[PDB]
Amino acid sequence: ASKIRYLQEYHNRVGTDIANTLKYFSQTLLSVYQGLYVTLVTLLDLVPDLGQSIFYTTTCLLPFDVLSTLPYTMISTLATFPPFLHKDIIEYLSTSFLPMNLSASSMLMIAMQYTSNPVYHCQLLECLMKYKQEVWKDLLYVIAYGPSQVKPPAVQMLFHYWPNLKPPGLVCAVEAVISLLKEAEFHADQRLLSQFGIWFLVSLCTPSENTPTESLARLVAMVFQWFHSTAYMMDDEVGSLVEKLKPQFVTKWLKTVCDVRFDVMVMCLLPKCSTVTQLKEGLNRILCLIPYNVISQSVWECIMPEWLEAIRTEVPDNQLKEFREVLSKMFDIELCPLPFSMEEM
Amino acid sequence: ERREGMLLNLLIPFVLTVGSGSKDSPWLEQPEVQLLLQTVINVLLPLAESTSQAAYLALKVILVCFERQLGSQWYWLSLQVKEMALRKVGGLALWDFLDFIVRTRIPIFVLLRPFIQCKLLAQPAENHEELSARQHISDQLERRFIPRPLCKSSLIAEFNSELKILKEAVHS
């Protein structure tokens, strides 16, 4: 047992003697700890070939209660080890996954953030699928709450392992859609996130009377913000494809939700960092929605009185000129493609 | 003896002024964000009750306002928060910090989910004051989605209100 103390002392001072002691531990465990793991976890910090020998002892021990905490810590290695050790860690996880619950989701949060190779987290998802019935919720958590640079790989793997998520042409899914759409606004592979988010929205988001009011309101608010963000994007080949596909999907979904749930559609466009700037942003959002003929006469009659009242009351009397370039752009029949006449407008 | 005033008078107002106002805040560079995070954690890890509350409020403000700027710095933050939980640094309002993390589901929430769920909740409660917060956190963990975040405006308003309350409580 003194070899464990020697290993701890060597680690404190710092594979000449440590590697030999690890081999001794492995060969002692093979023949036939709880007190050994305190140094096994320290082995993760010890390393910063050699790492393969370090993890071979763990590979021997795993087939040989606290085991629930074993993977995450091992997965934590991916965040500190040199790039070459990531392949060995992935291989060891796949090999020792047979003896191997929510922490695996957090595993992706690491595996999709430090490893640029798709194969690593692809194999992690493959070995998780054989031991987790619903792996989609892990990626949903990762996309909805994780940061950027984790959302793209998670979305790509989610669409790869679930081909059904491509339409021809619950709450966690809504949050994932919201985050995916907010990615585009934060950008203003960025367009790929918007494309995938719109595809997922069309696939697994059908408005109905059973949809919760708050979830649908959040979804429609993010859709409108995303439309405003995509309006100012530059026109490229990917830009042209986006601007051509968007009337096919986003406009159709907005029409459907307006036909079914008009209350949320109206509530989202109401005025409700300064107040004047917020009113200008909302007015610009409505003006951006206008060219896609989303706003009908009912929508206009329901939203415009509130906006004008807010402009009259909330906005001070600083000549109101800030809103002019917006309002003059919303009350012109020639400028807007609305079939509204002067009487209707 | 002066870090409390810095946190409540300069650091928190500075982060609120810089981070808020836009979705992205490139006014402050990455080294400055690292320095501010180190300052807050040093107020935390290496404590007075008011000092700890101010430090946790500043940590929340930095996590929310400078979320994008942190980038590939969530594992170390999760380790530091885990050490804070192990040491019982906050004592009080540490459960409030964890409740805030669960509410906002900030990028550290996905990393701290296993520790909070399987490990932290396994430990027995000491006092009813912490018992209520622990029960609220447990309720917020499962069978409760409550999508509160909205364009970071509500979070910034909450931070400013808490800063005002703490400032009023300090001088009294």
Q: Apex CA A239: angle with CA A336 and CA A300, to 5°?
A: 25
Number of helical (H) and strand (E) elements in chain A, helices listed first: 18, 0
Q: Which two tokens stand for residue A303?
A: 């939203």
Cα B80 from Cα B93, distance rounded (Å): 17
Cα A270 from Cα A260, distance rounded (Å): 18
Q: Which residue has the tokens 């640094």?
A: B89
Q: Which amino acid is at A309?
A: E
Assess contact for A55 and A92: CB atoms under 8 A: yes
B88: left (phi over 0), alpha (psi -120 to 50) or beta: left
Collapsed DSSP state (helix, strand, coil) of residue B140: helix
B27-30: long-range contacts at Cβ-Cβ below 8 A with a sequence spacing of 24 or more? B28/B66, B28/B69, B30/B69, B30/B71
Nearest to A97 by CA among A125, A121, A122, A128: A128
Cα B100 from Cα A336, distance rounded (Å): 45
Assess contact for B64 and B104: CB atoms under 8 A: yes
Q: Which amino acid is at A79?
A: A
Cα A110 from Cα A72, distance rounded (Å): 9
Cα B154 from Cα A100, distance rounded (Å): 42
DSSP state of A5: H
Q: Which two tokens stand for residue A335?
A: 């400028």
3-state DSSP of A209-273? CCCCHHHHHHHHHHHHHHHHHHHCCCCCHHHHHHHHHHHHHHHHHHHHHHHHCHHHHHHHHCCCC
Assess contact for A182 and A222: CB atoms under 8 A: yes
Q: Which residue of A has its CA nearest to B110?
A: A106
The length of chain A in residues reads 345
Cα A302 from Cα A300, distance rounded (Å): 5
Cα B122 from Cα A199, distance rounded (Å): 41
| Nearest CA-CA distance, residue A213 and chain B, Å | 12
Nearest to A180 by CA among A206, A160, A150: A150
Count CB neighbours of B163 within 10 A: 20
Nearest to A149 by CA among A104, A188, A105, A179: A179
Cα B160 from Cα B167, distance rounded (Å): 10
* Nearest CB partner across the interface for B109, out of A69, A145, A149: A145
Cα A158 from Cα A176, distance rounded (Å): 12
Assess contact for B77 and B45: CB atoms under 8 A: no
The length of chain B in residues reads 172
- B154 contacts on A by Cβ (under 8 Å): none
Cα A26 from Cα A20, distance rounded (Å): 10
Contacts of A86 by beta carbon, 8 Å cutoff, 6+ apart: A78, A114, A115, A117, A120
B68–A148 C-beta distance less than 8 A? yes
3-state DSSP of A126-176? HHHHCCCCCCHHHHHHHHHHCCCCCHHHHHHHHHHHCHHHCCCCCHHHHHH
Contacts of A63 by beta carbon, 8 Å cutoff, 6+ apart: A96, A99
Cα A195 from Cα A239, distance rounded (Å): 11
Return the half-sphere exposure (C-beta side, CA atoms, 13 A cut-off) of residue A237. Answer: 0
Method: cryo-EM
Cα A206 from Cα A253, distance rounded (Å): 8
Return the half-sphere exposure (C-beta side, CA atoms, 13 A cut-off) of residue A316. Answer: 4
A53 vs A11, A62, A162, A247, A322, CA distance in Å? 16, 15, 37, 57, 68
Assess contact for B103 and B148: CB atoms under 8 A: yes
Distance of CA B168 to the CA centre of its chain: 20
Assess contact for A183 and A216: CB atoms under 8 A: no
Cα A86 from Cα A88, distance rounded (Å): 5
Collapsed DSSP state (helix, strand, coil) of residue B127: coil
B119–A147 C-beta distance less than 8 A? no
Contacts of B72 by beta carbon, 8 Å cutoff, 6+ apart: A113, A114, A149
Assess contact for A230 and A222: CB atoms under 8 A: no
Q: Which residue has the tokens 């409390």?
A: B4
A186–B24 C-beta distance less than 8 A? yes
Largest separation between any pair of C-alpha atoms in chain A: 93
Cα A119 from Cα A126, distance rounded (Å): 10
| Nearest CA-CA distance, residue A124 and chain B, Å | 17
Q: At what angle do helices A190-203 and A237-260 cross, to 10 degrees?
A: 30
3-state DSSP of B33-74? HHHHHHHHHHHHCCCCHHHHHHHHHHHHHHHHHCHHHHCCCH
* Nearest CB partner across the interface for B110, out of A142, A148, A174: A142
Cα A291 from Cα B72, distance rounded (Å): 40
Q: Which residues of A touch B (CB under 8 A)?
A: 68-69, 72, 76, 79, 102-103, 105-106, 109-110, 113-114, 141-142, 144-149, 171-172, 174-175, 178, 182, 185-186, 214-215, 218, 221, 273
Q: Which two tokens stand for residue A286?
A: 């409505």
Cα B118 from Cα A165, distance rounded (Å): 32
Q: Which two tokens stand for residue A224?
A: 């409108």
Cα B4 from Cα B2, distance rounded (Å): 5
For A67-93, letters b (16+ CB in 10 Å) and e give eebbbbebbbbbbebeeebbebbbebb
Q: Apex CA A113: angle with CA A108 and CA A115, to 5°?
A: 95
| Nearest CA-CA distance, residue B91 and chain A, Å | 25
Nearest to A180 by CA among A154, A213, A206: A154
Phi, psi torsion values for B62, nearest 5 degrees: -70, -40
Cα A135 from Cα A137, distance rounded (Å): 6
Q: Which two tokens stand for residue A169?
A: 């042409």
Assess contact for A191 and A239: CB atoms under 8 A: yes
CA dihedral A108, A113, A115, A120 (to 10 degrees): 20
Cα A27 from Cα A47, distance rounded (Å): 21
B91: left (phi over 0), alpha (psi -120 to 50) or beta: left
A217 vs A107, A174, A200, A205, CA distance in Å? 32, 11, 17, 13
Assess contact for A234 and A240: CB atoms under 8 A: no
Assess contact for B20 and B64: CB atoms under 8 A: no
| Nearest CA-CA distance, residue A101 and chain B, Å | 8
A186–B23 C-beta distance less than 8 A? yes
Cα A110 from Cα A77, distance rounded (Å): 9
Q: Which residue of A has its CA nearest to B105?
A: A145
Q: Which amino acid is at B76?
A: W
Phi, psi torsion values for B125, nearest 5 degrees: -80, 150
Count CB neighbours of A241 within 10 A: 12
Cα B39 from Cα B34, distance rounded (Å): 9
Q: Apex CA B142: angle with CA B139 and CA B143, to 5°?
A: 90
A340: left (phi over 0), alpha (psi -120 to 50) or beta: beta
Q: Which two tokens stand for residue B162?
A: 């808490």
Burial level of A219, CB count in 10 A (0-12/13-18/19+)?
buried
| Nearest CA-CA distance, residue B1 and chain A, Å | 34
Assess contact for A62 and A99: CB atoms under 8 A: yes
A283 vs A115, A116, A335, A336, CA distance in Å? 43, 41, 15, 14
Count CB neighbours of A286 within 10 A: 22
Q: At what angle do helices A103-114 and B74-87 cross, to 10 degrees?
A: 140
